[PDB]
């Protein structure tokens, strides 16, 4: 393409891409298990495990039903002592009564305190499992979420892909025959898709099939955009007419009707092949004859006076008035296409249309408030001991007096 | 456009939109933190905190790997008393033995009951944190979910937007230069997109970049749809041929090839500018000459006999038979286009094609079953006391008898 | 279409679809409740219930704000006994002191152990509720997730659909008038869409409106793809020019400009009707005249030499060289179109372009590691008893000696 001349004719070079053919996909199947198997203690976990299983059922039942509906497609000393003996009997009884109190404590601890602590401790294990199961489900939701949400034609996540290739993106590239450029484009446009082929509700299983495309590259084939704008010819304005997309290989030109192709930032990805032969008369408009080109005179039509590409603004500021905003100055033009630079202002006016230049805004962040947590309530150790020591001191005094009396007697 | 005549020619006025140019986007970066910082007690939370951190790692590792792979693009009284003294010794021993029982209780409570309650209480704090962390992750999943699921070109959520603008949609509108009409269209077609530029797994951080478009409006520019159907000319039928989309500004007309534009309910949003000049011969078909218009005679082709817009059905019921279903009656036509109203029936037949009119269905709801929960198990207070009172009553009787004997002696 | 001849001309039969008109949608509204009502005990659940409610507020506030911003659109014996009586007093005191120790135990259990167990048990109920509420929210996230994430034009999930029709997909089909074929296509292309009309943050309610399309079928109408490739005419090559998509009904042909239609694996779903009449000259190219067809000579253009459909590769291997890779052999051609079979190799070369045939890869799986859990810590029953029995044995010996002395006295 002879741009040195084509620019004066009125056609501005636009974006440059590449050319790829979608081809036929490869397939890999994964079984995703929603319910983990927890062995060991069962009585402490059954309560939370059952509620978790119910969550899984509520999610999968609608998938199983949809797949079935869709199945076709899928002296008086004696008197004095009498008093003594009665006193001893009273202490013999007091001891027995003390034991009744001790027995009451044993009963209360053994029957009301210990059983509660043991039942509660088992319940604590259950809650721990309920938390783990909930977190596991969430991990699945971020990977196979889209597949669970709708059974057919979902975008597959990056986590699902790393599962498929066992945490190895080197293997993904070489197995599929992708370069780093192809992987970017494939993820960018969502070209990796999956479907659910079957489910089994009671086991929590889904059979998820993922299709990975096999794009092929057409060597030395570049898709080139052309953007025509009006230009001034001896006092009035004209428009040059060309196909907006032309395919250039080496020395050959053809047209592409890219109405049914996927367009990414660097490549046009088409099914089959959309290149069609180009007539001689029009080839001259790109090769350097720069005549004919069906230039049309414009009288009663709206015709563009600017074009945008890669952040730049191109405009005809010779035929009409264009100005820079917030500097309050016009832009002159001495060529038919003037380039307006983005380091003068961010808002330009061309005719009656304002063109806004994008800009960078400052950074922000998302987080939870940091919250300090206090310690658990701690029960102190039992402090009795000195009292027990005294009881022993009181007791041997009793012992000492008895031996004392036996000696005198 | 001279619709008063164009209708008789055979072209039905279709939907009316507006015209906007996508322009160049502005950028804002946010750091999203997946792991909160919890200070204070550490031993009670480390267990659940660690499992949570593991959840975050499983989600981000596939993102870090993908971004690296993609990096290039990113008397015998004495005998009688001897018996008395022996009895006293037996009670002295019984007291000592009682203390052994009390010591056993102290040992059991202090060593097996208290330590368990304290360890369990700390575990309760841990579970509380595990729940909070799980809920926090879920909040993130509903806002930055799409970004975590696939690193490139995701739709950004409304929650992510309110984070970017600090819970203020007044600022979003004025900063970007949007009207309420532009915000609706931008959200409707998913024009706000983001990408992940980098991640750091161990801190749980992702660097998420969001691009907000700067749409510009072309003043007094209306995109008008035209819908041609067949009509009867002296016994046979013809079709008028016009571009389906024409751009009308004021007194100027141009064509738009909207095959690569985004179409919303009220506006057509195109990159650059797709308006092209229109020839005089065809302008007359819209201005009021209503001749030429390349009317073509149809002999061996399938040609539409109806058109739909905004819920209405337009049809040619003069050349062919059309009927209302569930009333079992034909519709006559006396004009070439008959309008069928939707308050007569919901299903119309035009030729061999059934046209279904939509209708409103009754309301439903989604909720959990409401479940009543009972009280916790409550351990009663210790009820001993009257027994202790009796022990004291028994004891002073012992006291009273001793003083009694000392008096007699 | 006379394919028996058209193939020799240079046009390959491509994919065959069907023809449907999108029509006008029906509407059904559901109220989705994010906060369940839990009756019964309140003090044990308020803490976790409140944190849950806060989660709901953080999710819905951005929805309420967006909808408001968008509102416009929405002898010395006496001496000897004196010693005896003193000994008895010492045991009377020892008993009283023992009671003080017992009272200390009662105090400690009643004040520091029991209150903690009771407060802790109530806290256990709270944690159980916090887990249930978290799981409930997740169930919602998998069904109405997309709607919460962005208020306008979201794809509705399969779980949301089963909610709308009360777990009955038989009713969905008959109510809407869908066949199993229509349901598949509707889900495949995401044609069921919803919007949020209003929310109420404090109750956790969202008003979600779902639109279900009413597709109509055009009887005996088949959309047929045609794929032209170059062919050799007496030493040089030519390309035949036809519209890529033609509509065949019975004996009638028309063209379809499917640039604005949705294409599924079996049907083309268009708004209104895009069929346009076809001229006689070109009809002959399909009916069997197989002349004219604007065959163009190609001199300086890139022209396709192969076409792909349903996994098959068609190519011109007469004019240019094509070979099978990994067998290292050429493919000869004796017809202008050679069919390359996929059971010989998976990679073919046609000219300079490699064509990759897809293949099946082995199965994988996703699951959590299975982890065995141990038992809870269990506190043993209190083992005192034999000691108590001995205390009773010691005591009646005391009893026996006292009665013994009373007899001698
Ligand atoms: C679980 O309950 C069963 C009774 O069904 C019992 O036999 C078993 O010992 C219990 N196991 C545990 C750890 O409590
Ligand atoms: C008091 O005597 C009891 C006898 O059962 C013994 O267990 C305890 O350790 C002694 N305490 C002191 C301080 O001597
Ligand atoms: C946590 O454990 C450390 C021992 O690593 C100990 O020194 C510290 O006191 C403990 N803190 C709490 C609240 O238990
Ligand atoms: C019984 O005597 C003990 C002595 O230790 C005292 O603590 C307790 O309160 C008294 N109880 C009654 C009812 O008098
Ligand atoms: C809850 O707390 C209130 C005091 O606000 C009290 O009256 C009520 O009895 C308590 N209920 C339970 C089950 O603890
Ligand atoms: C010992 O005597 C006490 C009296 O309070 C009684 O409760 C306990 O059961 C007796 N134990 C044995 C083994 O006789």
Numbering used by the authors:
A (entry chain C), B (entry chain B), C (entry chain A): 23 to 96, 140 to 399, 402 to 476
Quote the authors verbatim.
Langya virus (LayV) was recently found in shrews and isolated from febrile patients in China, representing the first human-infecting HNV from shrew origin. HNV infections are facilitated by the attachment glycoprotein (G) and the fusion glycoprotein (F). Upon G-mediated receptor engagement, F is triggered and promotes membrane fusion and viral entry. LayV F and G are closely related to MojV F and G but distantly related to their NiV and HeV counterparts.
Using EM imaging of negatively stained samples, we observed that LayV F formed well-folded compact homotrimers, typical of the prefusion state, but that the protein spontaneously refolded to the postfusion state. As a result, we collected two cryoEM datasets 4 mo apart and determined structures of prefusion F and postfusion F at 2.5 Å and 3.9 Å resolution, respectively. Postfusion LayV F forms a ~150 Å-high and ~70 Å-wide conical trimer with a prominent triple helical bundle assembled from the central helices and HR1, surrounded by three antiparallel HR2 helices yielding a 6-helix bundle at one end of the trimer. The opposite end of the molecule forms a triangular base. HR1 and HR2 motifs of each F protomer interact exclusively with the other two protomers forming an intertwined network. Glycans at positions N65 and N459 are resolved at the periphery of the elongated trimer. In contrast to prefusion F, the fusion peptide and transmembrane regions would be located at the same end of the structure to promote membrane fusion. Postfusion LayV F shares its overall topology with other paramyxovirus postfusion F trimers as well as with postfusion coronavirus S trimers, highlighting the evolutionary relationships of these fusion machineries. Although F refolding affects a large fraction of the trimer, the N-terminus, the β-rich domains comprising residues 281 to 420, and the upstream helix remain mostly unchanged, besides modification of their relative orientations. This conformational transition leads to a greater than twofold enhancement of the surface area buried at the interface between each pair of protomers within the prefusion F state (~2,180 Å2) and the postfusion F state (~5,220 Å2), underscoring the irreversible nature of these structural rearrangements.
